[PDB]
Coordinates of all heavy atoms in Angstrom, one line a residue:
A99 N -42.2 -7.1 47.2 CA -42.5 -5.7 47.6 C -41.4 -5.0 48.3 O -41.7 -4.5 49.4 CB -43.8 -5.7 48.4
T100 N -40.2 -5.0 47.8 CA -39.0 -4.5 48.5 C -38.6 -3.1 48.0 O -38.0 -2.4 48.8 CB -37.9 -5.5 48.5 OG1 -37.8 -6.1 47.2 CG2 -38.1 -6.6 49.5
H101 N -38.8 -2.8 46.8 CA -38.3 -1.6 46.2 C -39.3 -0.6 45.8 O -40.5 -0.9 46.0 CB -37.4 -1.9 44.9 CG -38.2 -2.2 43.7 ND1 -38.3 -1.3 42.6 CD2 -39.0 -3.3 43.4 CE1 -39.1 -1.9 41.7 NE2 -39.6 -3.0 42.2
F102 N -38.9 0.5 45.3 CA -39.9 1.6 45.0 C -40.2 1.6 43.5 O -39.4 1.8 42.7 CB -39.2 3.0 45.4 CG -39.5 3.4 46.8 CD1 -38.9 2.7 47.8 CD2 -40.2 4.5 47.1 CE1 -39.2 3.0 49.1 CE2 -40.5 4.8 48.4 CZ -39.9 4.1 49.4
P103 N -41.5 1.4 43.2 CA -42.0 1.6 41.8 C -41.7 3.0 41.3 O -41.6 3.9 42.1 CB -43.5 1.3 41.9 CG -43.7 0.6 43.2 CD -42.3 0.4 43.9
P104 N -41.7 3.2 40.0 CA -41.6 4.6 39.5 C -42.8 5.4 39.9 O -43.9 5.0 40.1 CB -41.6 4.4 38.0 CG -41.1 3.0 37.8 CD -41.6 2.2 39.0
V105 N -42.5 6.7 40.1 CA -43.5 7.7 40.5 C -44.3 8.1 39.3 O -44.0 7.8 38.1 CB -42.9 8.9 41.2 CG1 -42.2 8.5 42.5 CG2 -41.9 9.6 40.2
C106 N -45.4 8.9 39.5 CA -46.3 9.4 38.5 C -45.5 10.4 37.7 O -44.5 11.0 38.2 CB -47.5 10.0 39.0 SG -48.8 9.9 37.8
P107 N -45.9 10.7 36.4 CA -45.2 11.7 35.6 C -45.3 13.1 36.3 O -46.3 13.7 36.4 CB -46.0 11.7 34.3 CG -46.5 10.3 34.2 CD -46.9 10.0 35.6
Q108 N -44.1 13.6 36.6 CA -44.0 15.0 37.2 C -42.6 15.5 36.9 O -41.7 14.7 36.6 CB -44.3 14.9 38.7 CG -43.8 13.7 39.4 CD -44.5 13.4 40.7 OE1 -45.4 14.1 41.1 NE2 -44.2 12.2 41.3
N109 N -42.5 16.8 37.0 CA -41.2 17.5 36.7 C -41.0 18.6 37.7 O -41.8 19.6 37.8 CB -41.2 18.1 35.3 CG -39.8 18.5 34.8 OD1 -39.2 19.4 35.4 ND2 -39.4 17.8 33.8
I110 N -39.9 18.5 38.5 CA -39.6 19.5 39.5 C -38.9 20.7 38.9 O -39.0 21.8 39.5 CB -38.7 18.9 40.7 CG1 -37.4 18.4 40.1 CG2 -39.4 17.7 41.3 CD1 -36.2 18.6 41.1
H111 N -38.2 20.5 37.8 CA -37.6 21.7 37.2 C -38.6 22.6 36.5 O -38.3 23.8 36.4 CB -36.6 21.2 36.1 CG -36.0 19.8 36.4 ND1 -35.3 19.5 37.6 CD2 -36.1 18.6 35.8 CE1 -34.9 18.2 37.6 NE2 -35.4 17.7 36.5
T112 N -39.7 22.1 36.1 CA -40.7 23.0 35.5 C -41.2 23.9 36.6 O -41.3 23.6 37.8 CB -41.9 22.1 35.0 OG1 -42.3 21.2 36.0 CG2 -41.5 21.4 33.8
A113 N -41.5 25.2 36.2 CA -41.9 26.2 37.1 C -43.2 25.9 37.8 O -44.2 25.5 37.1 CB -42.0 27.6 36.4
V114 N -43.3 26.1 39.1 CA -44.5 25.8 39.9 C -44.5 26.9 41.0 O -43.5 27.6 41.3 CB -44.4 24.5 40.6 CG1 -44.7 23.4 39.6 CG2 -43.1 24.2 41.3
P115 N -45.8 27.2 41.5 CA -45.9 28.2 42.6 C -45.0 27.8 43.7 O -45.3 26.8 44.4 CB -47.4 28.1 42.9 CG -47.9 26.9 42.3 CD -47.1 26.7 41.0
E116 N -44.0 28.6 44.0 CA -42.9 28.2 44.9 C -43.4 28.3 46.4 O -43.0 27.6 47.3 CB -41.7 29.0 44.7 CG -41.4 29.3 43.2 CD -40.7 28.2 42.5 OE1 -40.6 27.1 43.1 OE2 -40.3 28.4 41.3
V117 N -44.3 29.3 46.6 CA -44.8 29.5 48.0 C -45.6 28.3 48.5 O -45.6 28.1 49.8 CB -45.7 30.8 48.0 CG1 -44.8 32.0 47.8 CG2 -46.8 30.7 46.9
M118 N -46.2 27.5 47.7 CA -47.0 26.4 48.1 C -46.1 25.3 48.6 O -46.4 24.7 49.7 CB -47.9 25.9 47.0 CG -48.8 24.8 47.3 SD -49.7 24.8 48.8 CE -48.9 23.7 49.9
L119 N -45.0 25.0 47.9 CA -44.2 23.8 48.3 C -43.5 24.0 49.6 O -43.1 25.1 50.0 CB -43.1 23.6 47.2 CG -43.6 23.5 45.7 CD1 -42.3 23.6 44.8 CD2 -44.4 22.3 45.5
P120 N -43.3 22.9 50.4 CA -42.6 23.0 51.7 C -41.2 23.4 51.5 O -40.5 23.1 50.5 CB -42.8 21.6 52.3 CG -43.0 20.7 51.1 CD -43.7 21.5 50.1
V121 N -40.6 24.0 52.6 CA -39.3 24.5 52.5 C -38.3 23.3 52.3 O -37.3 23.4 51.5 CB -38.9 25.2 53.8 CG1 -39.3 24.5 55.0 CG2 -37.4 25.6 53.9
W122 N -38.5 22.2 53.0 CA -37.5 21.1 52.9 C -37.5 20.5 51.5 O -36.6 19.8 51.1 CB -37.9 20.0 53.9 CG -39.3 19.4 53.7 CD1 -40.4 19.9 54.3 CD2 -39.6 18.4 52.9 NE1 -41.5 19.1 53.9 CE2 -41.0 18.2 53.0 CE3 -39.0 17.5 52.0 CZ2 -41.8 17.2 52.3 CZ3 -39.7 16.5 51.3 CH2 -41.1 16.4 51.5
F123 N -38.6 20.8 50.7 CA -38.7 20.3 49.3 C -37.9 21.2 48.4 O -37.0 20.7 47.7 CB -40.2 20.3 48.9 CG -40.4 19.6 47.6 CD1 -40.8 18.3 47.5 CD2 -40.3 20.3 46.4 CE1 -41.1 17.7 46.3 CE2 -40.5 19.7 45.2 CZ -40.9 18.4 45.2
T124 N -38.2 22.5 48.3 CA -37.4 23.4 47.5 C -36.0 23.5 47.8 O -35.1 23.5 47.0 CB -38.1 24.8 47.5 OG1 -39.2 24.8 46.6 CG2 -37.1 25.8 47.0
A125 N -35.7 23.5 49.1 CA -34.3 23.7 49.6 C -33.4 22.4 49.2 O -32.2 22.6 49.1 CB -34.2 23.9 51.1
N126 N -34.0 21.3 49.1 CA -33.3 20.0 48.9 C -33.8 19.4 47.6 O -33.8 18.1 47.5 CB -33.4 19.1 50.1 CG -32.7 19.6 51.3 OD1 -31.9 20.6 51.2 ND2 -32.9 18.9 52.4
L127 N -34.3 20.2 46.6 CA -34.5 19.7 45.3 C -33.5 18.8 44.7 O -33.8 17.8 44.0 CB -34.6 20.9 44.3 CG -35.9 21.8 44.4 CD1 -35.6 23.1 43.8 CD2 -37.0 21.1 43.6
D128 N -32.2 18.9 45.1 CA -31.2 18.0 44.6 C -31.4 16.6 45.1 O -31.3 15.7 44.3 CB -29.8 18.5 45.0 CG -29.6 20.0 44.7 OD1 -29.1 20.3 43.6 OD2 -29.9 20.9 45.6
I129 N -31.7 16.4 46.4 CA -32.0 15.1 46.9 C -33.3 14.7 46.3 O -33.5 13.5 46.0 CB -32.0 15.1 48.4 CG1 -30.6 15.1 49.0 CG2 -32.8 14.0 49.0 CD1 -29.8 16.4 48.9
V130 N -34.3 15.6 46.1 CA -35.6 15.3 45.6 C -35.4 14.7 44.2 O -36.2 13.8 43.8 CB -36.4 16.6 45.5 CG1 -37.5 16.5 44.5 CG2 -37.0 16.9 46.9
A131 N -34.4 15.1 43.5 CA -34.2 14.5 42.1 C -33.9 13.1 42.1 O -34.3 12.3 41.2 CB -33.0 15.3 41.4
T132 N -33.2 12.6 43.2 CA -32.9 11.1 43.3 C -34.2 10.3 43.4 O -34.3 9.3 42.8 CB -32.0 10.9 44.5 OG1 -32.8 10.7 45.7 CG2 -31.0 12.0 44.6
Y133 N -35.1 10.8 44.2 CA -36.4 10.1 44.3 C -37.3 10.3 43.0 O -38.0 9.3 42.6 CB -37.2 10.6 45.5 CG -36.7 10.1 46.8 CD1 -35.6 10.7 47.5 CD2 -37.3 9.0 47.5 CE1 -35.2 10.3 48.7 CE2 -36.8 8.5 48.7 CZ -35.8 9.2 49.3 OH -35.3 8.7 50.5
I134 N -37.2 11.4 42.4 CA -38.1 11.8 41.3 C -37.7 11.3 40.0 O -38.4 11.4 39.0 CB -38.4 13.3 41.3 CG1 -39.8 13.6 40.7 CG2 -37.3 14.0 40.5 CD1 -40.9 13.1 41.5
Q135 N -36.5 10.7 39.9 CA -36.0 10.2 38.6 C -36.8 9.0 38.1 O -37.4 8.3 38.9 CB -34.5 9.8 38.7 CG -34.3 8.6 39.7 CD -32.8 8.6 40.1 OE1 -32.1 9.5 40.0 NE2 -32.4 7.4 40.7
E136 N -37.0 9.0 36.8 CA -37.7 7.9 36.1 C -39.2 7.9 36.5 O -39.6 6.9 37.1 CB -37.1 6.5 36.4 CG -35.6 6.5 36.1 CD -35.2 7.0 34.7 OE1 -35.9 6.7 33.7 OE2 -34.2 7.8 34.6
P137 N -39.9 8.9 36.2 CA -41.4 8.9 36.4 C -42.1 8.1 35.4 O -41.7 8.0 34.2 CB -41.8 10.3 36.4 CG -40.9 10.9 35.4 CD -39.6 10.2 35.6
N138 N -43.2 7.4 35.8 CA -44.0 6.6 34.9 C -45.5 6.7 35.2 O -45.9 7.0 36.3 CB -43.6 5.1 35.0 CG -43.9 4.3 33.8 OD1 -45.0 3.6 33.7 ND2 -43.1 4.4 32.8
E139 N -46.2 6.6 34.1 CA -47.7 6.6 34.2 C -48.3 5.5 35.0 O -49.3 5.8 35.8 CB -48.3 6.6 32.8 CG -47.7 5.5 31.9 CD -46.4 5.9 31.2 OE1 -45.7 6.7 31.8 OE2 -46.2 5.5 30.1
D140 N -47.8 4.3 34.9 CA -48.2 3.2 35.8 C -47.6 3.5 37.2 O -46.5 3.0 37.5 CB -47.8 1.9 35.2 CG -48.3 0.7 36.0 OD1 -48.9 0.9 37.1 OD2 -48.2 -0.4 35.5
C141 N -48.3 4.2 38.0 CA -47.8 4.6 39.3 C -48.7 4.3 40.5 O -48.3 4.6 41.6 CB -47.4 6.1 39.2 SG -48.9 7.4 38.5
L142 N -49.9 3.8 40.3 CA -50.8 3.6 41.4 C -50.4 2.5 42.3 O -50.8 1.3 42.1 CB -52.2 3.4 40.8 CG -52.8 4.4 39.9 CD1 -54.2 4.2 39.5 CD2 -52.6 5.8 40.4

């Protein structure tokens, strides 16, 4: 249990209501991409 399993299927580049998302998220989408890479359905 040392590493991070893949996240659920999601896409940050796809358009979403921007007002809802926190500032640190939209402003640092680039860093967000490192965590969000390789999403998988088996994510629970």
Side-chain angles (χ1 to χ4, degrees):
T100 38
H101 77 109
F102 271 66
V105 297
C106 205
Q108 35 206 354
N109 193 298
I110 64 144
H111 332 299
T112 51
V114 288
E116 323 281 7
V117 288
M118 181 45 258
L119 306 171
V121 48
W122 60 267
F123 189 97
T124 279
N126 292 350
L127 284 157
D128 310 271
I129 282 78
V130 156
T132 84
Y133 285 84
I134 207 63
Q135 62 199 17
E136 307 310 316
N138 203 261
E139 46 277 30
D140 186 348
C141 49
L142 305 188

